[PDB]
PDB file of C-alpha atoms in Angstrom:
ATOM      1  CA  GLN T   1       9.191 -18.052  12.950  1.00  0.00           C
ATOM      2  CA  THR T   2       8.836 -17.411   9.205  1.00  0.00           C
ATOM      3  CA  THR T   3       7.321 -14.010   8.410  1.00  0.00           C
ATOM      4  CA  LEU T   4       7.575 -11.516   5.579  1.00  0.00           C
ATOM      5  CA  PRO T   5      10.877  -9.586   5.456  1.00  0.00           C
ATOM      6  CA  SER T   6       9.126  -6.317   6.456  1.00  0.00           C
ATOM      7  CA  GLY T   7      11.149  -3.861   4.407  1.00  0.00           C
ATOM      8  CA  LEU T   8      10.152  -0.707   2.570  1.00  0.00           C
ATOM      9  CA  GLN T   9      11.557   0.376  -0.794  1.00  0.00           C
ATOM     10  CA  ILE T  10       9.720   3.029  -2.806  1.00  0.00           C
ATOM     11  CA  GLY T  11      10.225   3.445  -6.534  1.00  0.00           C
ATOM     12  CA  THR T  12      10.610   6.750  -8.328  1.00  0.00           C
ATOM     13  CA  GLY T  13       9.426   6.376 -11.919  1.00  0.00           C
ATOM     14  CA  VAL T  14      10.429   5.548 -15.474  1.00  0.00           C
ATOM     15  CA  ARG T  15      12.652   7.388 -17.946  1.00  0.00           C
ATOM     16  CA  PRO T  16      13.431   6.727 -21.609  1.00  0.00           C
ATOM     17  CA  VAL T  17      17.034   5.649 -22.124  1.00  0.00           C
ATOM     18  CA  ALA T  18      17.567   5.152 -25.847  1.00  0.00           C
ATOM     19  CA  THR T  19      15.930   4.517 -29.208  1.00  0.00           C
ATOM     20  CA  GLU T  20      17.595   1.639 -31.040  1.00  0.00           C
ATOM     21  CA  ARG T  21      17.283   1.401 -34.817  1.00  0.00           C
ATOM     22  CA  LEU T  22      16.720  -2.042 -36.321  1.00  0.00           C
ATOM     23  CA  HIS T  23      19.456  -2.004 -38.975  1.00  0.00           C
ATOM     24  CA  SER T  24      17.948  -4.969 -40.791  1.00  0.00           C
ATOM     25  CA  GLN T  25      17.701  -5.504 -44.556  1.00  0.00           C
ATOM     26  CA  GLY T  26      14.781  -3.923 -46.381  1.00  0.00           C
ATOM     27  CA  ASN T  27      13.108  -5.164 -49.525  1.00  0.00           C
ATOM     28  CA  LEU T  28      14.145  -4.006 -52.990  1.00  0.00           C
ATOM     29  CA  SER T  29      11.627  -2.317 -55.285  1.00  0.00           C
ATOM     30  CA  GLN T  30      12.238  -1.677 -58.978  1.00  0.00           C
ATOM     31  CA  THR T  31      12.094   1.914 -60.208  1.00  0.00           C
ATOM     32  CA  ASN T  32      13.378   1.047 -63.728  1.00  0.00           C
ATOM     33  CA  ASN T  33      15.753   4.035 -63.572  1.00  0.00           C
ATOM     34  CA  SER T  34      19.392   3.819 -64.646  1.00  0.00           C
ATOM     35  CA  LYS T  35      21.002   6.018 -61.961  1.00  0.00           C
ATOM     36  CA  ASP T  36      19.583   4.399 -58.801  1.00  0.00           C
ATOM     37  CA  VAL T  37      21.509   1.929 -56.646  1.00  0.00           C
ATOM     38  CA  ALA T  38      20.590  -0.310 -53.719  1.00  0.00           C
ATOM     39  CA  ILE T  39      22.747  -1.741 -50.936  1.00  0.00           C
ATOM     40  CA  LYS T  40      22.772  -5.512 -50.404  1.00  0.00           C
ATOM     41  CA  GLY T  41      24.123  -6.077 -46.906  1.00  0.00           C
ATOM     42  CA  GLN T  42      25.920  -3.495 -44.777  1.00  0.00           C
ATOM     43  CA  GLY T  43      27.491  -0.187 -45.747  1.00  0.00           C
ATOM     44  CA  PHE T  44      26.654   3.490 -46.134  1.00  0.00           C
ATOM     45  CA  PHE T  45      27.395   5.993 -48.864  1.00  0.00           C
ATOM     46  CA  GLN T  46      29.332   9.164 -48.084  1.00  0.00           C
TER      47      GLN T  46
ATOM     48  CA  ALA V   1     -22.036  12.762  47.857  1.00  0.00           C
ATOM     49  CA  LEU V   2     -23.194  15.083  45.051  1.00  0.00           C
ATOM     50  CA  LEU V   3     -19.585  14.755  43.853  1.00  0.00           C
ATOM     51  CA  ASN V   4     -19.702  11.219  42.461  1.00  0.00           C
ATOM     52  CA  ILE V   5     -21.421  12.810  39.453  1.00  0.00           C
ATOM     53  CA  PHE V   6     -17.996  13.972  38.275  1.00  0.00           C
ATOM     54  CA  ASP V   7     -16.587  10.474  38.776  1.00  0.00           C
ATOM     55  CA  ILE V   8     -19.457   8.894  36.828  1.00  0.00           C
ATOM     56  CA  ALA V   9     -19.106  11.351  33.954  1.00  0.00           C
ATOM     57  CA  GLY V  10     -15.326  10.950  33.853  1.00  0.00           C
ATOM     58  CA  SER V  11     -15.619   7.170  33.766  1.00  0.00           C
ATOM     59  CA  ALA V  12     -18.154   7.454  30.946  1.00  0.00           C
ATOM     60  CA  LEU V  13     -15.830   9.746  28.991  1.00  0.00           C
ATOM     61  CA  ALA V  14     -12.868   7.410  29.492  1.00  0.00           C
ATOM     62  CA  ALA V  15     -14.896   4.384  28.387  1.00  0.00           C
ATOM     63  CA  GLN V  16     -16.167   6.165  25.277  1.00  0.00           C
ATOM     64  CA  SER V  17     -12.630   7.261  24.416  1.00  0.00           C
ATOM     65  CA  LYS V  18     -11.402   3.675  24.794  1.00  0.00           C
ATOM     66  CA  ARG V  19     -14.140   2.356  22.516  1.00  0.00           C
ATOM     67  CA  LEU V  20     -13.449   5.036  19.909  1.00  0.00           C
ATOM     68  CA  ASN V  21      -9.729   4.231  20.009  1.00  0.00           C
ATOM     69  CA  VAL V  22     -10.455   0.531  19.483  1.00  0.00           C
ATOM     70  CA  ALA V  23     -12.720   1.331  16.533  1.00  0.00           C
ATOM     71  CA  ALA V  24     -10.102   3.626  14.992  1.00  0.00           C
ATOM     72  CA  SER V  25      -7.413   0.970  15.396  1.00  0.00           C
ATOM     73  CA  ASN V  26      -9.630  -1.603  13.684  1.00  0.00           C
ATOM     74  CA  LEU V  27     -10.294   0.807  10.815  1.00  0.00           C
ATOM     75  CA  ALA V  28      -6.557   1.405  10.457  1.00  0.00           C
ATOM     76  CA  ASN V  29      -5.909  -2.361  10.430  1.00  0.00           C
ATOM     77  CA  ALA V  30      -8.852  -3.160   8.139  1.00  0.00           C
ATOM     78  CA  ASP V  31      -6.635  -4.482   5.327  1.00  0.00           C
ATOM     79  CA  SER V  32      -3.463  -5.366   7.234  1.00  0.00           C
ATOM     80  CA  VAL V  33      -1.861  -8.814   7.344  1.00  0.00           C
ATOM     81  CA  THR V  34       1.069 -10.706   8.932  1.00  0.00           C
ATOM     82  CA  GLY V  35       1.551  -8.696  12.089  1.00  0.00           C
ATOM     83  CA  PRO V  36       4.390  -9.383  14.520  1.00  0.00           C
ATOM     84  CA  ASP V  37       5.641 -12.988  14.580  1.00  0.00           C
ATOM     85  CA  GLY V  38       3.444 -13.744  11.558  1.00  0.00           C
ATOM     86  CA  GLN V  39       0.139 -14.352  13.336  1.00  0.00           C
ATOM     87  CA  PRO V  40      -2.787 -12.857  11.380  1.00  0.00           C
ATOM     88  CA  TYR V  41      -4.389  -9.717  12.748  1.00  0.00           C
ATOM     89  CA  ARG V  42      -7.731 -10.139  14.505  1.00  0.00           C
ATOM     90  CA  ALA V  43     -10.259  -7.450  15.338  1.00  0.00           C
ATOM     91  CA  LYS V  44     -11.116  -6.568  18.926  1.00  0.00           C
ATOM     92  CA  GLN V  45     -14.123  -5.182  20.790  1.00  0.00           C
ATOM     93  CA  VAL V  46     -14.755  -3.811  24.278  1.00  0.00           C
ATOM     94  CA  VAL V  47     -17.333  -4.780  26.889  1.00  0.00           C
ATOM     95  CA  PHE V  48     -18.955  -2.182  29.133  1.00  0.00           C
ATOM     96  CA  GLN V  49     -19.863  -3.024  32.720  1.00  0.00           C
ATOM     97  CA  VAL V  50     -21.338  -1.062  35.610  1.00  0.00           C
ATOM     98  CA  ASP V  51     -19.628  -0.574  38.966  1.00  0.00           C
ATOM     99  CA  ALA V  52     -22.074  -1.739  41.632  1.00  0.00           C
ATOM    100  CA  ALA V  53     -20.753   0.365  44.503  1.00  0.00           C
ATOM    101  CA  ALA V  54     -27.250   0.375  42.921  1.00  0.00           C
ATOM    102  CA  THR V  55     -26.065   3.046  40.473  1.00  0.00           C
ATOM    103  CA  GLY V  56     -22.470   3.483  39.379  1.00  0.00           C
ATOM    104  CA  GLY V  57     -20.116   4.395  36.583  1.00  0.00           C
ATOM    105  CA  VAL V  58     -19.059   2.376  33.565  1.00  0.00           C
ATOM    106  CA  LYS V  59     -15.796   0.481  33.135  1.00  0.00           C
ATOM    107  CA  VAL V  60     -14.169  -1.738  30.519  1.00  0.00           C
ATOM    108  CA  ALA V  61     -12.780  -4.934  32.032  1.00  0.00           C
ATOM    109  CA  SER V  62     -10.715  -6.099  29.050  1.00  0.00           C
ATOM    110  CA  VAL V  63     -10.558  -6.057  25.259  1.00  0.00           C
TER     111      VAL V  63
END
């Protein structure tokens, strides 16, 4: 009555799709310079 | 009849072929499971018997 479905399905393999960057917030280290700036939050210079 | 030798040898060859086929089938189904209708697979053997026509050939009654 109840048996296994008896079906075949062969895989092929694995491929890399993407590399996501963790755009988190990094720590701030003091360089004591007067012409260095750091971003707090989001945003990029141009 | 000096010609029943061929019959005896042919029966022996057929019996040996049957036994080899059974052994090969068992080896193929060594690690099988859940055959038709779900009943588990079970191994089988053959039994040789002589045809008392005295001296006679070999036969396999059933598996």
